[PDB]
UniProtKB/Swiss-Prot annotation:
Belongs to the DOCK family. Residues 174-358 form the C2 DOCK-type domain. Guanine nucleotide exchange factor (GEF) for Rho and Rac. GEF proteins activate small GTPases by exchanging bound GDP for free GTP. Along with DOCK1, mediates CRK/CRKL regulation of epithelial and endothelial cell spreading and migration on type IV collagen. It is found in: Cytoplasm; Cell membrane; Cell projection, Podosome. Interacts with CRK and CRKL. Interacts (via N-terminus) with tensin TNS3 (via N-terminus); the interaction increases DOCK5 guanine nucleotide exchange activity towards Rac. Interacts with ELMO1. Coiled coil: none annotated. The lineage of its organism: Eukaryota, Metazoa, Chordata, Craniata, Vertebrata. It comes from the Eukaryota. The chain holds residues 270 to 818 of 1870 of the full protein. The modification Phosphoserine is found at S96. It comes from Homo sapiens (Human). The DOCKER domain may mediate some GEF activity. This is Dedicator of cytokinesis protein 5.
C-alpha cells in the first residue's frame, strides 16, 4: 500500500493499569509470505498461499511501562527467520554417511519460532528487521487522539486489547469476536504427503449465504468474506494460532455461524484448483439454549462426504460441528432409540478454535437465560437462583436491568413461596456486592438509572423488607451471618429499591392504605436492629461495626 508507508502507525488501546504492570510484554510481528507455495522457478505455483517466514520480537515491557518515551528513537526490532538450514552445512560431511532424514525448515508453526525467539533474547537478524518508534500515550482512544493528535490522528490505525478494561464504561458497545485457529489434525488419507490444510473460514447465516467482509485478518484491515489460514507445507497437524477479528452485528451474530472449510493445496496450481475442500467444519456462534458461543476453546469436527451435503446449511449446520456436540447427541440418542444411526463420515479429523468474545450484549450462561426465561423455566427457578450466584458478574452487568426485573416479577407472580423470595434476596445481595466492586462500580449509576426510570415494582418492597427483617431477627445464625452481613454491605441500593417500590405503590394507589403498616414495618425493623445490637458483642463485633458503618 503506497499510501500507508508514512501512515503505518499502530496504536494499542485498552492497555489498562494491569496491562502496564505485566512483568513481560513483547511486541511480536508475524511475518508470513503470500504467494507461491514453493520457491521454485520452472513451473507455475499456486499464488496467494500463506507460508510462515519469521517472527520479530522485542521485549517492550519497559516501553509500555513508559521507562523510555521518545519519538526520535527508532527501535530496530531484529527479525528472526525460520531455520531453513539445509544448504550450507550439507557440503561438508565425509567418511561416515549414515543419515535418512527429510527437510523441515518451513513446516514449523510460527508458535515454535515465536517461542524460540522469546527464549533467545539475541535474534540472529543479520541485517534484517524493522524500525518502529515506540511510545506510551496515557489515556483511552479519545484523549490520545486529542492530547497526542500530532503523533496519533484519526488516520492512525487502532488496535484493541485481548481482554477487557478494568473500567467497562456504561455503553462500551463491542462485538469483538477473536477466532484463533489453534490446531487441527487432518488425516492424509491416500495422499502420501501430509495434506496441506488451510482453514478458509466462511461465515454463513443459517441459510448458508456467505457473509461478506465479516471476517477481519487483523487491525488496520477491512473485513473479508472468507479468511485463509497459513498454508503449511505437508504437515499432518498444522498449528495456526491465527488471531483474526470477526465483526458481526450483535443481533445478527445470533443468526450467524462460521463455517470452517479445509482444502488441500498441492504443489501445483491445477491440482490446487482441481481439489475441493476434503473436509469442512463449522462452529455455531450461539449455544442451543439461546446464549452466544461460550468464551473458551471449541473442538470442531471435520466432515467428509458429499460436497453439496457438506456445504448445504440445511444439513451440515444440523450436524454436530464440535466434538462436544457429537458427544451430547450420542448421549441423548442412548436413551431414545428412535431413528439414531451414527454416520460413518465421522472421521478422526477435527479442528480446534479459541473464541475470545469481547461483547457487551452477548450472553454466555444457561442459568442467566433460564432466570430470564423464568416464566417458562419455572421448574428451574429454584435451581436458577441457586446457580446464578456462581455466574461471573461480568456477564451479569450486561443485563443487570433485566435480571432485576425478572427477579421482581418472580416476586410479584409467586410471592407465596417464600423460599424463592429468600433466593432472590440473596442473589440480589450478591448482585449489589459485585456491582459495588471497582470493576463494576460505574454500572451502579446505570443501576440507579434502572431504579429511578425502569423499576416496575409496587409491592416487592414489602417482601424485601420482610426478608431483611428476618435476616436481622435471625442474626445470630452463622450461616445467615455472612448473608446478613453482605446485605448490610449492600443496604443502600437495597433500600433505594424498596423505597422506589413503595413510592410506585403510592402513585399507583394514590394514598397508602398501608402507610401506617409500612412505617410499622420500619419500626419493628429498627427494633430488630436494636435486638441484634444489644446481643453480646462477641458473636458479631464485625457485624456491629459494619452496621455502624
Amino acid at each position: 500500500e503506497i499510501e500507508k508507508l508514512n501512515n503505518l502507525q499502530a496504536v494499542f488501546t485498552d492497555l489498562s493499569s494491569m496491562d502496564l504492570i505485566r512483568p513481560r510484554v513483547s511486541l511480536v510481528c508475524q511475518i508470513v509470505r503470500v504467494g507461491h507455495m514453493e520457491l521454485k522457478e520452472g513451473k507455475k505455483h499456486t499464488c496467494g498461499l500463506r507460508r510462515p517466514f519469521g517472527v520479530a520480537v522485542m521485549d517492550i515491557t519497559d516501553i509500555i511501562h513508559g521507562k523510555v518515551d521518545d519519538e526520535e528513537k527508532q527501535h530496530f526490532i531484529p527479525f528472526q527467520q525460520i531455520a531453513m538450514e539445509t544448504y550450507i552445512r550439507q557440503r561438508q560431511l565425509i567418511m561416515s554417511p549414515l543419515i535418512t532424514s527429510h527437510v523441515i525448515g518451513e513446516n514449523e508453526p510460527l508458535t515454535s519460532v515465536l517461542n524460540k525467539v522469546i527464549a533467545a533474547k539475541e535474534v540472529n537478524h543479520k541485517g534484517q528487521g524493522l524500525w518502529v518508534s515506540l511510545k506510551l500515550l496515557p489515556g483511552d482512544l479519545t484523549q490520545v487522539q486529542k492530547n497526542f493528535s500530532h503523533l496519533v490522528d484519526r488516520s492512525t490505525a487502532i488496535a484493541r486489547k485481548m481482554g477487557f478494561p478494568e473500567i467497562i464504561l456504561p455503553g462500551d458497545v463491542r462485538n469483538d469476536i477473536y477466532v484463533t485457529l489453534i490446531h487441527g489434525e487432518f488425516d492424509k488419507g491416500k495422499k502420501k504427503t501430509p495434506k496441506n490444510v488451510e482453514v478458509t473460514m466462511s461465515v454463513h447465516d443459517e441459510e448458508g449465504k456467505l457473509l461478506e467482509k465479516a471476517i477481519h485478518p487483523g487491525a488496520g484491515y477491512e473485513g473479508i468474506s472468507e479468511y485463509k489460514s497459513v498454508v503449511y507445507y505437508q504437515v499432518k497437524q498444522p498449528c495456526w494460532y491465527e488471531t483474526v477479528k470477526v465483526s458481526i452485528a450483535i443481533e445478527e451474530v445470533t443468526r450467524c455461524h462460521i463455517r470452517f472449510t479445509f482444502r488441500h493445496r498441492s504443489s501445483q496450481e491445477t491440482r490446487d484448483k482441481s481439489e475441493r475442500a476434503f473436509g469442512v467444519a463449522f462452529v455455531k456462534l450461539m449455544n442451543p439454549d439461546g446464549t452466544t458461543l461460550q468464551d473458551g476453546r471449541h473442538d470442531l469436527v471435520v466432515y467428509k462426504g458429499d460436497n453439496k451435503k457438506m456445504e448445504d446449511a440445511k444439513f451440515y449446520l444440523t450436524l454436530p460441528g464440535t466434538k462436544m456436540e457429537m458427544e451430547e447427541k450420542e448421549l441423548q440418542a442412548s436413551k431414545n432409540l428412535v431413528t439414531f444411526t451414527p454416520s460413518k463420515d465421522s472421521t478422526k479429523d477435527s479442528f480446534q478454535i479459541a473464541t475470545l468474545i469481547c461483547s457487551t450484549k452477548l450472553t454466555q450462561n444457561v442459568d442467566l437465560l433460564g432466570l430470564l426465561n423464568w416464566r417458562s423455566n419455572s421448574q428451574n427457578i429454584k435451581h436458577n437462583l441457586k446457580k446464578l450466584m456462581e455466574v461471573d458478574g461480568g456477564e451479569i452487568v450486561k443485563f443487570l436491568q433485566d435480571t432485576l426485573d425478572a427477579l421482581f416479577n418472580i416476586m410479584m407472580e409467586m410471592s407465596d413461596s417464600e423460599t424463592y423470595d429468600f433466593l432472590v434476596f440473596d442473589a440480589l445481595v450478591f448482585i449489589i456486592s459485585l456491582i459495588g466492586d471497582i470493576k463494576f462500580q460505574h454500572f451502579n449509576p446505570v443501576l440507579e438509572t434502572y431504579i429511578y426510570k425502569h423499576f416496575s415494582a409496587t409491592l416487592a418492597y414489602v417482601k424485601l423488607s420482610k426478608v431483611l427483617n428476618f435476616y436481622v431477627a435471625n442474626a445470630d445464625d452463622s450461616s445467615k451471618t455472612e448473608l446478613l452481613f453482605a446485605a448490610l454491605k449492600a443496604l443502600k441500593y437495597l433500600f433505594r429499591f424498596i423505597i422506589q417500590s413503595r413510592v410506585l405503590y403510592l402513585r399507583f394507589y394514590g394514598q397508602s392504605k398501608d402507610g401506617d403498616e409500612f412505617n410499622n414495618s420500619i419500626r419493628q425493623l429498627f427494633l430488630a436492629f436494636n435486638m441484634l445490637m444489644d446481643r453480646p458483642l462477641e458473636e458479631a463485633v464485625k457485624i456491629k461495626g459494619a452496621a455502624l458503618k
